[PDB]
């Protein structure tokens, strides 16, 4: 039999091409490998994580190397407002001379790509000023990548493999990760800001060659050890400060100004220094909570066992959950993806409205790409969070050990949960779609005053509480007599209120009826996607149509045409259907973010306010209007620098449409077609001399759903990425 795959004898004995496809697709499902034990499972995962870490630091090293080698960082730092950053050089032998000239720009030697990832603003903010600064960072991270790779090898060796119990020491790992991984890293990052980043923003060079002889503050550690910590907040950078120079600069290293630096339109460095110092203290303290070898602290099992409501409303409460979580990796992975997935959305939300990197706001293409980038990654991570929660129920859930606790009771009323998610999705869809169609008919008939425009009073009321005085609510921070206004009037409100009431920045943009409709469409996306994913998890173990679904696993094709038909009945298929709704939801979010910002960046916000209340405005004034430059990247008269995005735009449409083939036409048609191809090859003279070793067969039922979904997603992403960058960059960049 064939060697590959070495981890499954069932696959290795398969004489068809399914062996190749399935061997690739089951490589990282360690639980399903032949001869796998629990202890070996954890040691493989531990080694794999070292490999992922090494790739991350190598990928970062490659970015640093290419910007220094081929970028214009040293030129960009001089005039960041009027210089486009360079990502890397182009060496494409297929280019014609017009293409070579078209992509030559920014004073570069030859053709180059313009960066959109914002690494220039990030690196410039943290104190990088020269190409040698980037070179040393690149070599340092390449070395760090090597060390992690060695550690992955080291801990696979006979005397360094951790035992099973080592991976299940919950109290000790939480203490270290909270205090050391989070707390000390944030404390160290405060050191960089105080010692390097802040001085560099004031025109003073600080490097490894002289940082031991430079005083971060005129009073060196006397305020710190004497408790007079307020001395570090005196004489902050003035409003006239020019970033990177000593004119208008101050001396404070810890402040709470609370606003935006007037020139760079980004958060103050002294606030970001005090921010990281504050959480570092909290995280270091929080890391002394759990039990270890020293006889103090909590044991997490005791905490869970205690929290059972005395009235029996939650049944057994949280009894038995410690083993349920501590013994299942899919439960832990589901909690990790759910938490990280939400934080990825939070990063996108806060970075566009509180830009932390100098000159990030003015780079419109970078801001658009960064928000879209992280929202699509958050969407995928959330779908994975529910997928592994569904896998937990099939593989790791033990009904006997969870008898009567909160987790078991979720399955008890799963119909109630699913029924109410169904109602909310239907309600939002009916009325959200209905109001849009109503407004479209009114616009078509020429009566824009007959449409249903609902003011977002609840959201506009929140903005009033934060100090936005446009709506006249005179509430909390919007009223100058409230205690909330007075107490903070000496710490951060003067800066915060100044920024929130500036209508040229993205801090709490003004909202109207157009924002009301879009937000309710977003809610429909979140609820429907949750409905599909939640049903896939709660019904994973069985249903009326298939009472014993657990005996078949997480992913199987179907149960056949009997009992009416069971296509797409596994929990794997519920995730597969939910990915479509996730793309649809994130698409609505990113269209809304992009269009509302293009109108702001052009100064004509009235277009969004008027055209966003009906769906023809989106199609006409956003998709059709902003495609004009994209599709002219190359035309019968020539081409320009946008021809790559024009080409990628159609490239996306093709991959997307190809995915329809794997999703619409199913296996039986193709297997019978391949059988005539097998006949044709064997009877053809001069070709039947050559022969195959793996019998050709059609893709499997499950494989084609993944392959179709992969093409659908890739075409989805590449189409909008090309349009997002091209429309934003050509308009302003």
């Amino acid at each position: 039999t064939k060697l590959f795959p070495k981890f499954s004898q069932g696959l290795a004995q398969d004489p068809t091409t399914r062996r190749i496809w399935y061997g690739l697709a089951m490589a990282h499902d360690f639980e399903s490998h032949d001869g796998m034990t629990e202890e070996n499972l954890y040691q493989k995962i531990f080694a794999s994580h070292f490999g992922q870490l090494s790739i991350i630091f190598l990928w970062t090293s490659g970015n640093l190397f290419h910007v220094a080698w081929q970028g214009n960082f040293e030129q960009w730092v001089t005039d960041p407002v009027h210089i486009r950053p360079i990502a890397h050089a182009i060496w494409d032998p297929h280019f014609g001379q017009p293409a070579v000239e078209a992509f030559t720009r920014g004073g570069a030697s030859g053709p180059v790509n313009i960066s959109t990832s914002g690494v220039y603003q990030w690196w410039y903010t943290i104190g990088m000023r020269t190409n040698q600064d980037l070179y040393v960072g690149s070599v340092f991270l390449a070395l760090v990548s090597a060390i992690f790779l060695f550690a992955g090898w080291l801990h696979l060796q006979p005397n360094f493999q951790p035992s099973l119990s080592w991976f299940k020491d919950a109290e000790s790992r939480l203490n270290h990760h909270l205090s050391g991984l989070f707390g000390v890293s944030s404390l160290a990052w405060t050191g960089h800001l105080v010692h390097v980043a802040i001085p560099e923003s004031r025109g003073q060079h600080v490097g490894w060659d002289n940082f031991l002889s430079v005083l971060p503050h005129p009073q060196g550690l006397t305020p710190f050890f004497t408790g007079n910590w307020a001395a570090y907040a005196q004489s902050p950078d003035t409003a006239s400060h020019v970033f990177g120079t000593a004119q208008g600069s101050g001396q404070a290293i810890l402040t709470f100004l609370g606003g935006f630096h007037p020139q760079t339109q980004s958060l103050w460095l002294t606030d970001m220094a005090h921010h990281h110092l504050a959480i570092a203290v909290i995280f270091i303290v929080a890391g002394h909570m759990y039990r270890t070898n020293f006889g103090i602290g909590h044991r997490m099992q005791a905490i869970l066992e205690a929290h059972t409501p005395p009235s029996g409303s939650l049944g057994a409460g949280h009894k038995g959950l410690f083993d349920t979580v501590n013994n299942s990796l899919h439960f832990q992975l589901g909690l990790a993806l759910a938490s990280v997935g939400t934080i990825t959305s939070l990063v996108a939300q806060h970075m566009y409205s509180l830009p932390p990197y100098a000159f990030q706001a003015i780079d419109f293409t970078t801001q658009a790409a960064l928000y879209t980038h992280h929202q699509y990654i958050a969407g995928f991570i959330m779908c994975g969070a529910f997928a592994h929660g569904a896998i937990f129920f099939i593989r790791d859930y033990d009904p006997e050990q969870n008898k009567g606790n909160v987790l078991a009771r979720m399955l008890d009323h799963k119909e109630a949960l699913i029924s109410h998610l169904s109602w909310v999705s239907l309600f939002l869809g009916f009325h959200t779609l209905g109001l849009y169609v109503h407004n479209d008919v009114m616009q078509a008939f020429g009566t824009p005053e007959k449409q249903i425009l609902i003011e977002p009073v609840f959201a506009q009321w929140i903005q009033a509480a934060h100090g936005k005085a446009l709506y006249g609510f005179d509430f909390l921070l919007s009223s100058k007599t409230s205690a909330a206004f007075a107490n903070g009037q000496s710490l951060w409100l003067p800066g915060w209120l100044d920024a929130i009431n500036n209508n040229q920045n993205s801090l709490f943009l003004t909202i109207g009826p157009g924002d009301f409709l879009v937000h309710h469409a977003i809610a429909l996306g979140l609820h429907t996607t949750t409905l599909i994913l939640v049903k896939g998890a709660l019904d994973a173990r069985g249903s009326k149509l298939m009472p014993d679904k657990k005996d078949f696993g997480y992913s199987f094709p179907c149960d056949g045409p009997g009992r009416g038909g069971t296509c797409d009945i596994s929990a794997y298929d519920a995730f597969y259907l939910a990915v479509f709704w996730m793309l649809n939801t994130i698409g609505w979010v990113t269209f809304y973010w992009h269009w509302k910002h293009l109108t702001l960046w052009q100064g004509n916000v009235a277009q969004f306010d008027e055209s966003s209340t009906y769906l023809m405005g989106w199609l006409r004034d956003y998709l059709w209007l902003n495609s004009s430059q994209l599709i002219n990247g190359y035309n019968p008269f020539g081409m320009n620098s946008l021809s790559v995005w024009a080409w990628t735009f159609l490239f996306g449409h093709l991959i997307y449409a190809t995915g329809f083939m794997f999703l619409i036409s199913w296996r039986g048609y193709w297997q019978e077609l391949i059988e005539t191809l097998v006949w044709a090859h064997e009877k053809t003279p001069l070709a039947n001399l050559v022969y195959w070793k793996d019998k050709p067969v059609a893709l499997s039922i499950v494989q084609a759903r993944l392959v179709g979904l992969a093409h659908f997603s890739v075409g989805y992403i590449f189409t909008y990425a090309a349009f997002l960058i091209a429309s934003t960059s050509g308009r302003f960049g």
Binding site: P399, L411, D412, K414, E415, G446, T447, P448, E449, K450, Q451, I452, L453, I454, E455, V457, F458, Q460, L470, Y471, G472, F473, G512, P513, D539, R541, G542, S543, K544, P547, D548, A606, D609, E610
Partner: protein, 165 residues
């Protein structure tokens, strides 16, 4: 006014919008005769347009910078400033009709469950019974509440089939 809005009766953009719509209608009018069929139809449209803009201003709606009416949904703000007719009152108008339709259908469904062949009473409607239940549904909120308090609104958990768990 509320949320920075202004009454449509006092809105400059709102007034300008009416002129634009009437101007469009007038432009088409001058290509016909005085009392021809097309001219009469266009004049009727202009009368409705003028009436519509007077009614919305008379109703005391709020117009934004777009000069288009906006509706207030918070019950407190609606009752505070006399906007109850935009969303708040229509909210209880719809629920009465929606409960009427749902309650009537539920009564009919229970009525035929007692018959020998309930399935044949669903494809082929028992019109005499349906009309009887249609009229009695006007008091559904009273009947609906009394069922809830007597405990006959919901089935017992033990009489409902559920999947293995």
């Amino acid at each position: 006014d509320i949320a920075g809005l202004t009454p449509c009766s006092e809105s400059k953009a709102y007034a300008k919008l009416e002129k634009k719509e009437l101007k469009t209608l007038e432009k088409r009018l001058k290509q016909y005769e005085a009392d021809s069929a097309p001219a009469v139809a266009l004049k009727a449209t202009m009368e409705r347009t003028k009436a519509r803009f007077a009614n919305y201003a008379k109703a005391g709606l709020l117009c934004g910078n777009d000069g288009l009416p906006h509706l207030i949904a918070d019950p407190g703000l609606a009752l505070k400033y006399g906007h109850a007719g935009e969303v708040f009152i229509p909210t209880f108008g719809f629920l009465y009709v929606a409960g009427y339709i749902g309650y009537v259908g539920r009564q009919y469904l229970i009525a035929v469950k007692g018959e020998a062949k309930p399935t044949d009473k669903e494809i082929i409607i028992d019109v005499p019974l349906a009309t009887k239940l249609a009229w009695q549904g006007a008091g559904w909120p009273l009947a609906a509440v009394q069922e809830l308090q007597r405990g006959t609104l919901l089935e017992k958990e033990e009489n409902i089939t559920v999947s293995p768990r």
